[PDB]
Each structure stands twice: as C-alpha cells, then as structure tokens.
Amino acid sequence: AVLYQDVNCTEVGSNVFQTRAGCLIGAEHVNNSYECDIPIGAGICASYQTQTSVASQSIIAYTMSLGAENSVAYSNNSIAIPTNFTISVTTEILPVSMTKTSVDCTMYICGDSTECSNLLLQYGSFC
Amino acid sequence: AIPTNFTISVTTEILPVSMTKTSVDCTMYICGDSTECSNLLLQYGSFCTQLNRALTGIAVEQDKNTQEVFAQVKQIYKTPPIKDFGGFNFSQILPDPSKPSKRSFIEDLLFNKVTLDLICAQKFNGLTVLPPLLTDEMIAQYTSALLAGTITSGWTFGAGAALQIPFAMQMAYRFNGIGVTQNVLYENQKLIANQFNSAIGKIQDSLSSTASALGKLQDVVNQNAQALNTLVKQLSSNFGAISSVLNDILSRLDPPEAEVQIDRLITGRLQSLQTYVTQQLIRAAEIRASANLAATKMSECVLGQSKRVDFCGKGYHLMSFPQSAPHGVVFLHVTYVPAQEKNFTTAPAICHDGKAHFPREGVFVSNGTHWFVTQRNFYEPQIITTDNTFVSGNCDVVIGIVNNTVYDPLQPELDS
Amino acid sequence: NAQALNTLVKQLSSNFGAISSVLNDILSRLDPPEAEVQIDRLITGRLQSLQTYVTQQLIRAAEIRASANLAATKMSECVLGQSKRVDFCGKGYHLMSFPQSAPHGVVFLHVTYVPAQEKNFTTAPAICHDGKAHFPREGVFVSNGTHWFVTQRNFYEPQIITTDNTFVSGNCDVVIGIVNNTVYDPLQPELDS
C-alpha cells in the first residue's frame, strides 16, 4: 500500500484514503479501530487482514485505537478494596554490551600494499 | 524546630520527549535532479543507505519515546460527570470539551508559547519532515486518562486494576505516606483545598506571562529547525567548484571535465549531510535520555508517590498531573512544603523511674514546662502515654535524657 | 553492529572516483606520480567511510552504556532489595527479581504482586464515637453494608474497630464526611469483672 507523504494525490479508484500524512493508495479505510502493528502517521496504522469472506489478502488503514475506554465509578464515599491477588512473573530484557569490534587501518585502507602505506602515513594520526 | 503550618505549592517542570522526525533523501539533496550527478553518487557507494537508515532509526526512536512516556495506561479512564473531589477545583487541568480536541486550560497556555517560505525550500531540496505517529489529540487523551486515574483511582491504576477511592481519602493516604498523619488533612481539608486551587491559579498565571518558562521545548524545536536551516545553506557553497548548482556545471563543462567539479561538489555536500546526520544522532540520544527521565518521572510521581527527595519537585511530593506540550510534557507537581517553624526544647528520651522512654513515632518537645510527643513534620502535640512510647533498658546509659512522668493511661481505670 | 560491520566491507567495493576499487589494480596500471592521486582519492574515501563507522559505533556504545547503567541500577534495586519505585521493576507492587543471562544482555524475571478482585465498599474517613473523632492508624474504614471494619489498604482482611486500630484526634464536628459508630473498646469485659 504505497503511501505518498504530503501529496493530496491529485497526481498519482476508491483505493485512496486521505490521511494527514498522505493519501494511502492501496488500502481500504476501516472505521473499526484496532490496536495497530504498523505505524503510518498522524494516528493511522495499516495492518494485514486475511479474511476468508472477501479479499483474503488486504491492507486496512484504520485510525489508531488507544485502548478500552473505562468509566471508573468515583463516589465521595465508595472505596474498592481488592479481595484476592495474583503473582505474575513478567520478563524484561535489557542489552548490556555489544560486540567488542576492532578495526586496523593499514589492513583495511590498504590492500597490504606498501605505496598505500606511504600515503596513509603521509595523512597523519587518524589511525 | 517543628513546623506548625504548611503550604501546598504547585511547581511546573518541563521535559522534552521527542524532536521532529525529519528525513533526508540524497539524490534530491546531493543532486539537483540531474542524472550525471546520480551516476557519480551511485559510483561513491552505500552512503545513502546508511544515511536513510540512521535517520529512520532516529524517527523510530522518537516514536518509541512518545509512546513510552505517555502510553503507560492500558485503558483510557474518564472522569465522572460529578466533580466533587472533596473541594479541589480541577477545572483547569481536567479536559475542556469546548475545544474539538479534548485539551485543557493549562495545556492550551502551552500550545501557544512554542509556535514550532522556508519549509517549502526544505521540502524541495529533499528535507522533508515526517508527521508524528501520536497526534496532539491522542496525546491529550492519554494525559486525560492519566489525570482521571490519578484523581479518582488514587495510584492503584498503575499497578493493576483501577480501584476507585474518594479523593479526600487518597490525599489522606499520601499525607500518611510523607510522615504527616492523616488527621491533619481531615482537619484542614478546606484550607488545603484553598491553597491548592490558589496554587493552580498561580501556575496558570505564571504560564500566561512569558514563554521563557518553556525554555526547554523552545530548544528541541529551535535546535532542530536551525540544524535543518543550516543544512540548506550548504547548497549555496562553491566547495571549490566554479559554481554551486549542478545545472550550471553541466551547462558549461563536458563529462570528463565536469566530473571532477561534480566530484568536488558531491564530496562536499555528502560531508555536510553527514555532519547533519551525526548532529541529529547525538541530539536524538540526548532527547532519548530526557524521554527516559520523563518516563520514570511519570511512572513514579504520577502513578504513585516518590520517596525520592527533590525528584518530583522540591518538597515532600504529594501528586503530579502530566500535561502535554509541543514536543514535550510538563508536570504539575503538588509538593507539601512546611511553612512556619517554631523552636522547641527537645529531649532524646525521658526517664520515668530509671527506665528510659523513647517515642516510637515522633520527637519529644516541650512548650517550656510540659512535655509532648509530636510527629516530626507537623506540630500536633500529644501527652506522653505508654502508647506513644516504648521502653528500653535503664536510663543512665542514654546521653541527654531528661526527667518527667509518663502519664500511664490506666491509673484512673485501675484505681476504681 | 553486524549490519554496521557488513556495510563497512561493502565500502571496499566503491570506486570513490578512481578508475578501479582495489589497490593492486591501480599500481598494476599507473605510475607513482600518477597513481598517487588515484590512491589519494581512494584513501580519503575509505578513511571517511571508516570514520563514519567509528562515529556510529561510539554513539551506539554510548546508548548501550545508558542501557547498561539502567540494568545496573535495576539489578542493584530490584534484585538486591525491593524497590518502592512504581512501575520500575515491572508493573505491580514488586516482590523480587531473578536476573538471567542472555546473548549480550540480561533478562529479569520480576515477580509482581497484582491485586486481582475488587469489591466495592462504603468507606468513611473517620468515626464519631462520643464526639471524639476516630481515625484508623493503618488502613481504611469500610462497611459490609451495616457494620464497620478497618481493613488494610491493599487487601480485604476486615477487623473490628478496637482502640488499637484507631487513634483519636480532637472532636468530630470539624472533619468532613465522618460517620457514627461504637468503637468497641477492648477493655469493657475486662473492667466489668
């Protein structure tokens, strides 16, 4: 689904869907907002929908859904105390180190030639 | 010196969260839509793949910043129709349905003092600006959800299921969490409400005076814009060649002789674009550090109450209310500040009959003759029963002990 | 990092302007005073590429250092203790963590207490007994509809309102929202006989 930024697609039917990023040529607009996996821009999120009814290969561009709307019932004398709990392990991954690489000039910059080594020595203290 | 009266003092605190998701295309920038320049730039190599990858990494990280600071709530809560939050007037921070976008009164005083042709030049030279994934509508709605969760459900809406609880009881919780027993708030609720509403009014005033309050967001938008603006003016550089535009070198010289001029111009323009990309990577790493700071300030000040001193604004922190902004987020820390001190003659312990007597919670003070055991952070004096005090050994070992009669609360009950 | 290294190699296959891309096929064609300019082109190009790589590596290493400092503090607080920081060591009241290694990283197993089942109640900020207010020293006042109970805040374990669960403060016409009840004094049957 080609996305043309900042082009109102007066220049490259019914497939367009004018979003505030750009009109998304090739995706069926869908009012039915879901949680989105591909980010497009300005609240629109395309996703792949395999539907065994019509167009088992299609791309839908819905407005991004924030989550289930809630209406907690606050009241000046009503409190809610939990009565049972649940212990819930949740993994959490963190990188700690990358690969300790190392690069040598004369072998990289020069293909083991000597004249190249003369020139690279003429350049200076980059290595 | 025990304080005798306090003051609640809202203090704004601004933090940048994301910069503008720019994006630069080589062939449109390095080459003035010419083809021979495209041949040469293809001869140089894979610099353009690297530049586009770096700038897309910046863009993706900006998206993750904006979506990690705010989107810390699975559900979008909503304030109830009634607004009797124990007497605290929240109409300045809660959403205002008058606007189409559900902003607030204080969010609006922010979206006006930043303000974020030239953009046409950048657009023509290939220096586009992508739009953010979260629009100001969705960001404002996330912040309204955070407000409605902090206000109604206390702070349990961060841990698990959001449990409603009266606002007065929640502020009692928070007071009891910063040392001051909740009887203080339950006695001074009206005074606290007054101080709080007046403090929000004062911060709304301070925001309607100068934009130098938002001195931070006015530099995440003013440094990136100036970087882009100095990336264009590198197109007007000879770089050694006999011109500065690639239509007036191919209209003068010939391929074997214009190729050296275009090599000069292309290595120069590529050097300039690489300088820009490196500056953008460094600035994006800085903004990522600031967005992590804002993420933890949201996960601790808003969704709870931080015991970290001077983290969530100076003073014992009570609660915060995040508010959106242009490429950033501002907080409204509500900080208990103890106002009026009043000297007292303390004593580390009390001899009664040789047994030492230490206060289990509080300090021993004296109005000059009597003795009292008050809490540490507010002067509320009580008599020294055997509940306020626990015994430990004799009282000739402790240094600085004084003498008094710890009133036993059973003498009149055991007498008859 | 692997892709950075992999794009550092493919810069050896770049003409950079010279009439070849390998320094054995420039010294096998041209002569020192004329091959020196070609090799100057190739060497300034390759040095520019290697400098771009080194700068990208420095920036990425600074980022990984920020992440390693975050992991260091998460280990010094979640594992070696118990953090009162909300939503730091996983969402929910954190209990304990168990670090586990990984390829160039570390994963944690945060054990987080999450309160499952809520159940509404009719609270009250205090309790009048005989004009004296009665606040719970630790907990909240709840009511199963008729009686009153003082439970802990995070789990429904109801107790009767003795004079231990409660401490007195002043009268009870000043506090807003107080209700009426009889705080069961735990000495009446003991002082009776």
Side-chain angles (χ1 to χ4, degrees), chain A residues 1-34 36-127, chain B, chain C:
Chain A
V2 171
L3 166 69
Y4 291 115
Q5 287 93 16
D6 68 13
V7 164
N8 214 340
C9 49
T10 51
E11 287 301 328
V12 183
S14 177
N15 270 318
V16 302
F17 172 48
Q18 182 56 58
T19 76
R20 292 295 91 194
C23 55
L24 175 44
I25 284 178
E28 301 159 71
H29 157 59
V30 163
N31 285 304
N32 289 337
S33 64
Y34 315 146
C36 79
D37 55 335
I38 308 173
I40 307 309
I44 299 318
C45 284
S47 62
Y48 191 45
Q49 184 180 5
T50 50
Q51 187 196 12
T52 173
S53 178
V54 175
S56 281
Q57 53 188 50
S58 193
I59 291 168
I60 49 172
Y62 42 78
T63 316
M64 199 176 122
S65 73
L66 304 168
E69 204 277 341
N70 217 340
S71 170
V72 62
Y74 163 89
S75 294
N76 76 329
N77 62 80
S78 201
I79 202 182
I81 322 286
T83 299
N84 201 26
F85 51 79
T86 189
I87 284 190
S88 82
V89 163
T90 62
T91 185
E92 184 183 35
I93 309 102
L94 294 168
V96 168
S97 82
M98 71 195 326
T99 71
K100 320 176 41 183
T101 176
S102 168
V103 186
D104 184 1
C105 288
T106 53
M107 273 187 76
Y108 179 87
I109 290 162
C110 303
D112 295 331
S113 295
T114 300
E115 312 86 332
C116 177
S117 280
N118 312 335
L119 300 188
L120 165 66
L121 263 292
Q122 293 326 94
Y123 276 4
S125 70
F126 270 114
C127 294
Chain B
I2 322 286
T4 299
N5 201 26
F6 51 79
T7 189
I8 284 190
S9 82
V10 163
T11 62
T12 185
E13 184 183 35
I14 309 102
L15 294 168
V17 168
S18 82
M19 71 195 326
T20 71
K21 321 176 41 183
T22 176
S23 168
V24 186
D25 184 1
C26 288
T27 53
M28 273 187 76
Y29 179 87
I30 290 162
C31 303
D33 295 331
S34 295
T35 300
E36 312 86 332
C37 177
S38 280
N39 312 335
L40 300 188
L41 165 66
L42 263 292
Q43 293 326 94
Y44 276 4
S46 70
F47 270 114
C48 294
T49 308
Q50 201 153 21
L51 293 167
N52 295 10
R53 170 161 305 114
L55 282 161
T56 50
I58 278 173
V60 160
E61 193 193 82
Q62 301 306 273
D63 184 1
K64 194 209 174 185
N65 285 351
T66 302
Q67 209 261 355
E68 195 89 342
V69 176
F70 295 116
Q72 276 165 328
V73 290
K74 312 307 157 193
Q75 317 201 352
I76 301 304
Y77 302 102
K78 201 60 78 165
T79 189
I82 207 64
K83 288 183 173 52
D84 63 353
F85 293 133
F88 304 180
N89 203 358
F90 281 144
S91 76
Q92 295 110 348
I93 60 184
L94 273 192
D96 282 342
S98 87
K99 299 296 183 181
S101 84
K102 298 257 189 53
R103 289 187 190 172
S104 178
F105 200 102
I106 304 184
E107 302 188 38
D108 280 10
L109 304 197
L110 299 166
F111 273 94
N112 288 331
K113 307 185 314 305
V114 171
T115 60
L116 295 174
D117 207 18
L118 273 158
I119 321 166
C120 290
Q122 305 159 16
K123 185 264 186 184
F124 286 149
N125 287 307
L127 301 156
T128 186
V129 161
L130 310 189
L133 167 66
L134 287 186
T135 59
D136 307 292
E137 293 177 350
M138 326 162 65
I139 284 174
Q141 186 171 359
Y142 281 159
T143 59
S144 68
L146 282 168
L147 295 174
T150 303
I151 286 167
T152 74
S153 200
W155 68 74
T156 182
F157 89 102
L163 323 170
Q164 74 274 25
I165 179 171
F167 199 93
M169 299 207 62
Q170 176 205 331
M171 285 286 300
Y173 272 9
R174 280 154 191 268
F175 269 26
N176 198 2
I178 65 166
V180 192
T181 55
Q182 70 270 45
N183 73 325
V184 163
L185 177 63
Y186 281 146
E187 283 138 26
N188 310 339
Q189 175 163 349
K190 303 314 286 192
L191 162 70
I192 286 177
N194 277 346
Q195 303 210 40
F196 181 26
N197 304 317
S198 178
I200 292 174
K202 294 275 292 174
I203 201 63
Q204 158 185 313
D205 261 347
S206 69
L207 277 188
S208 199
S209 48
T210 180
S212 178
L214 308 193
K216 306 197 198 180
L217 324 168
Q218 195 43 43
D219 280 331
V220 65
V221 300
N222 192 26
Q223 280 179 35
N224 166 269
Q226 173 175 80
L228 265 176
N229 207 16
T230 200
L231 193 45
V232 167
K233 296 172 183 52
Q234 290 287 88
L235 293 206
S236 87
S237 293
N238 268 276
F239 277 102
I242 76 165
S243 161
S244 49
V245 59
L246 302 204
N247 303 353
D248 306 359
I249 294 303
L250 314 173
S251 171
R252 281 189 198 138
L253 275 77
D254 56 271
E257 306 221 326
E259 263 194 3
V260 63
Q261 306 273 23
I262 305 313
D263 282 330
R264 254 170 195 158
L265 295 174
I266 302 312
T267 180
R269 282 182 191 181
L270 193 52
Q271 162 177 6
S272 69
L273 202 155
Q274 198 71 34
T275 309
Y276 166 73
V277 161
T278 301
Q279 299 303 324
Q280 268 314 98
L281 288 171
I282 284 149
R283 186 164 310 115
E286 199 283 332
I287 296 296
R288 165 210 64 92
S290 173
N292 286 355
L293 168 58
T296 194
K297 215 175 289 284
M298 183 96 58
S299 292
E300 303 193 355
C301 316
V302 189
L303 267 51
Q305 175 193 71
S306 61
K307 306 283 199 319
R308 314 177 50 163
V309 179
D310 279 11
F311 189 41
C312 312
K314 67 174 149 288
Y316 311 81
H317 164 266
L318 284 185
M319 44 175 46
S320 288
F321 315 108
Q323 304 278 44
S324 181
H327 297 331
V329 64
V330 313
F331 289 82
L332 296 190
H333 307 293
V334 165
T335 72
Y336 173 98
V337 171
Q340 289 158 29
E341 68 275 15
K342 172 168 181 64
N343 300 312
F344 285 114
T345 300
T346 176
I350 288 171
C351 289
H352 180 56
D353 48 344
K355 306 178 311 175
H357 273 265
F358 306 83
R360 62 182 40 184
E361 182 192 32
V363 285
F364 280 139
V365 297
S366 87
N367 82 322
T369 301
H370 312 120
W371 285 101
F372 297 115
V373 52
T374 77
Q375 39 199 355
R376 321 170 164 108
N377 284 308
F378 185 88
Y379 181 42
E380 173 263 353
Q382 299 276 37
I383 209 64
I384 306 98
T385 77
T386 66
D387 180 73
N388 303 315
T389 309
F390 69 88
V391 190
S392 168
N394 67 347
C395 76
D396 289 345
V397 60
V398 60
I399 295 100
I401 188 147
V402 309
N403 276 272
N404 185 277
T405 81
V406 286
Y407 153 70
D408 208 322
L410 280 74
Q411 287 273 134
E413 274 297 310
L414 66 88
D415 256 341
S416 295
Chain C
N1 166 269
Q3 173 175 80
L5 265 176
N6 207 16
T7 200
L8 193 45
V9 167
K10 296 172 183 53
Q11 290 287 88
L12 293 206
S13 87
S14 293
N15 268 276
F16 277 102
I19 76 165
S20 161
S21 49
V22 59
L23 302 203
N24 303 353
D25 306 359
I26 294 303
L27 314 173
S28 171
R29 281 189 198 138
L30 275 77
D31 55 271
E34 306 221 327
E36 263 194 3
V37 63
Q38 306 273 23
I39 305 313
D40 282 330
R41 254 170 195 158
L42 295 174
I43 302 312
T44 180
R46 282 182 191 181
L47 193 52
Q48 162 177 6
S49 69
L50 202 155
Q51 198 71 34
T52 309
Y53 166 73
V54 161
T55 301
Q56 299 303 324
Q57 268 314 98
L58 289 171
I59 284 149
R60 186 164 310 115
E63 199 283 332
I64 296 296
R65 165 210 64 92
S67 173
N69 286 355
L70 168 58
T73 194
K74 215 175 289 284
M75 183 96 58
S76 292
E77 303 193 355
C78 316
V79 189
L80 267 51
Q82 175 193 71
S83 61
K84 306 283 199 319
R85 314 177 50 163
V86 179
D87 279 11
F88 189 41
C89 312
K91 67 174 149 288
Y93 311 81
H94 164 266
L95 284 185
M96 44 175 46
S97 288
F98 315 108
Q100 304 278 44
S101 181
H104 297 331
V106 64
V107 313
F108 289 82
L109 296 190
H110 307 293
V111 165
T112 72
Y113 173 98
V114 171
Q117 289 158 29
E118 68 275 15
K119 172 168 181 64
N120 300 312
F121 285 114
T122 300
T123 176
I127 288 171
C128 289
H129 180 56
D130 48 344
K132 306 178 311 175
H134 273 265
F135 306 83
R137 62 182 40 184
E138 182 192 32
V140 285
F141 280 139
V142 298
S143 87
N144 82 322
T146 301
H147 312 120
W148 285 101
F149 297 115
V150 52
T151 77
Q152 39 199 355
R153 321 170 164 108
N154 284 308
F155 185 88
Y156 181 42
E157 173 263 353
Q159 299 276 37
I160 209 64
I161 306 98
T162 76
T163 66
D164 180 73
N165 303 315
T166 309
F167 69 88
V168 190
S169 168
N171 67 347
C172 76
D173 289 345
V174 61
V175 60
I176 295 100
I178 188 147
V179 309
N180 276 272
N181 185 277
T182 81
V183 286
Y184 152 70
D185 208 322
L187 280 74
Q188 287 273 135
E190 274 297 310
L191 66 88
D192 256 341
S193 295

